[PDB]
Amino acid sequence: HWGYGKHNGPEHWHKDFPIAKGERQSPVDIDTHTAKYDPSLKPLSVSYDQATSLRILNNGHAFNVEFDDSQDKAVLKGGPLDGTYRLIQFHFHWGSLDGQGSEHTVDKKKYAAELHLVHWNTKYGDFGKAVQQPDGLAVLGIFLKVGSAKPGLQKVVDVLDSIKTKGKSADFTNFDPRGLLPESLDYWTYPGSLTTPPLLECVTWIVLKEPISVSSEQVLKFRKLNFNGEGEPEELMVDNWRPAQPLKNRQIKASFK
Numbered sequence: 001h002w003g004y005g006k007h008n009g010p011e012h013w014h015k016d017f018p019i020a021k022g023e024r025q026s027p028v029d030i031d032t033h034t035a036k037y038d039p040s041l042k043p044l045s046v047s048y049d050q051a052t053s054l055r056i057l058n059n060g061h062a063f064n065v066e067f068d069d070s071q072d073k074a075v076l077k078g079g080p081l082d083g084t085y086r087l088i089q090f091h092f093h094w095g096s097l098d099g100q101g102s103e104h105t106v107d108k109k110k111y112a113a114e115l116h117l118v119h120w121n122t123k124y125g126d127f128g129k130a131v132q133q134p135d136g137l138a139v140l141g142i143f144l145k146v147g148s149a150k151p152g153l154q155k156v157v158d159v160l161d162s163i164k165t166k167g168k169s170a171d172f173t174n175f176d177p178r179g180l181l182p183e184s185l186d187y188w189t190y191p192g193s194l195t196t197p198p199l200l201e202c203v204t205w206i207v208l209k210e211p212i213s214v215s216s217e218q219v220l221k222f223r224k225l226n227f228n229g230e231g232e233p234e235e236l237m238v239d240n241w242r243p244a245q246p247l248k249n250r251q252i253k254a255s256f257k
Ligand SMILES: NS(=O)(=O)c1ccccc1
Pocket: 116, 118, 139, 193, 194, 195, 196, 197
């Protein structure tokens, strides 16, 4: 099965998932000087006040905080998006060291980690149908740098001990994802894909320019998670990021002048 090891990592994925070499793969390097301000972008609206988190799960690749998406509770609208996109889950990608871990890069700079808030287009009824559409998903990406602690992340950090290994889950109700955002909503946007198999080309990426700061201690606890299941040889869950892919026939647009 696919993973992030030398034997099953990003360089191998194309053998099971040929779209890995496709025309709109993610992540990409964001060359800030080539990205162009787009006046046609509408104001971005992140509306998370009624979010209903449910559970946190170690899926053997990362951990997902899952939300109730049976109604328009936490939604993303505006910006490059047509219509309403509902939050279904968030997760992170991170490194073994502070100098790597992000999937997107900014002028080739790698951040320590990257948060993905995953949303599906409500016009398609469910997530499964949405991933059969070129505009099925919107992922809000947020970079993490190591510095001061992020208070809104601590509840996540403290529950990780209970989901150490693949397949473990825990209740995670009443978590407010608003606490994971930076001050500014300035962003870059481009059409791309899921960054893990099945690598489906359904995503409008919205990558915030301002990183959030998290403490060394917070990211260290991410690195104590395990890729393996309980009772199996320990393989630390680190470096669960795909590197930047060819931009090909795409333009990255900026929300800011
Ligand atoms: N990593 S990502 O593109 O946000 C992703 C989201 C949902 C499923 C698989 C991958």
